[PDB]
Design a protein around this nucleic acid. Structure first.
Lengths: 192, 192
DNA sequence: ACGTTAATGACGATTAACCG
DNA sequence: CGGTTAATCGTCATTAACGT
């Protein structure tokens, strides 16, 4: 199915730009070629597109984070790897980031709990690394630091709608956001 | 007495929690203690509630930022004041932050341009202070740093839904997020 | 003013009725 | 299999039509 992939990619782009509710199934159909309710030959309803997109990305993030900590010999290398991983993600899959923290509530209850579980576990991987690096760090403080870092890195979605970010933009942004993130986590640590 | 204010405060809470489109006038009426499309005796349509909320907050933020830079003797004091101001906003008016960067697209075109103007000008205030502190800093890098800081500070809206909001939580979060922000901006600066 | 309860009218997700 | 186009059917914002 290259129509199945074409619909999901159209849905991803349109949900990011316009939001879930304001996107008309016919618009997704149209953008993929064929449309109105051709969609139902691939999917059983709107919601199922959103579910595939968000269950997919939330599972990928958790698996990728675990892979990073698995391969890392030491906790400093693990943190560096998690930053790199999430930075690649934030720069590369901005649309799925924007959908995940704008449209989570529009999931069927079952799917919503599955995505919240994968997200909670992704935060816990970061919290686990930060607390092992600083045994004096309270759970609550580690969580706050983690969310703050995701916010810092996910600030290209908020400064990038459909802009350049090919040449010096990609490499420059990566350098600056990594430096900001590394310094942020060091200062949090020396206050706490 | 304050029926207009009661509707806006209900609309602010519900738009933040459920998003603009999924909120029914009747839900806002209900919560304000005034069933139904009574709303039309105060406002000419849904959209006008969203417009008042977002034109209001975007104008406030710009005015507040200008006030901070006006009163500050030195650029270090100005940056500290802008951080404090935005931190107070992020901790205190989380609902309006969430609505502004989730539901901007659902404004009438005129209102959307007014809010984007006030947002652009608010970013420019931060950019002005950062470039005067570091004349070697390019415009593009200052903007990236500004957006990164807003992202970092607006990470309590994403970790806090009507939670606490208590003594130690407010003051603790403020301390930690300020330390992260100050360190982030110092490290960005010494890379650039 | 303000509010209440019935229309009205769109719009948009499913679904039915028909082809390869 | 996928697709099509013309019904349904619910759900709202918005208006009417009536009291305050």
């Amino acid at each position: 199915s290259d129509r199945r992939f074409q619909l999901l990619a159209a849905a991803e782009r349109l949900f990011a730009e316009r939001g879930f509710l304001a996107v008309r199934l016919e618009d997704i159909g149209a953008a993929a070629g064929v449309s109105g309710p051709a969609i139902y030959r691939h999917f059983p309803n709107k919601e199922s597109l959103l579910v595939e997109l968000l269950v997919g990305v939330s599972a990928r993030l958790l698996a990728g984070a675990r892979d990073v900590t698995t391969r890392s010999a030491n906790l400093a290398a693990a943190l560096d790897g998690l930053i790199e991983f999430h930075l690649d993600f934030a720069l590369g899959e901005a649309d799925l980031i924007r959908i995940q923290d704008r449209d989570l509530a529009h999931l069927p209850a079952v799917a919503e709990r599955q995505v919240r579980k994968a997200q909670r576990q992704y935060v816990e991987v970061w919290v686990g690394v930060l607390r092992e690096l600083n045994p004096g760090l309270a759970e609550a403080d580690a969580r706050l630091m983690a969310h703050a870092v995701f916010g810092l890195l996910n600030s290209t979605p908020h400064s990038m709608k459909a802009a350049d970010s090919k040449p010096a933009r990609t490499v420059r942004a990566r350098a600056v956001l990594r430096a900001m993130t590394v310094a942020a986590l060091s200062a949090a640590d020396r206050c706490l």
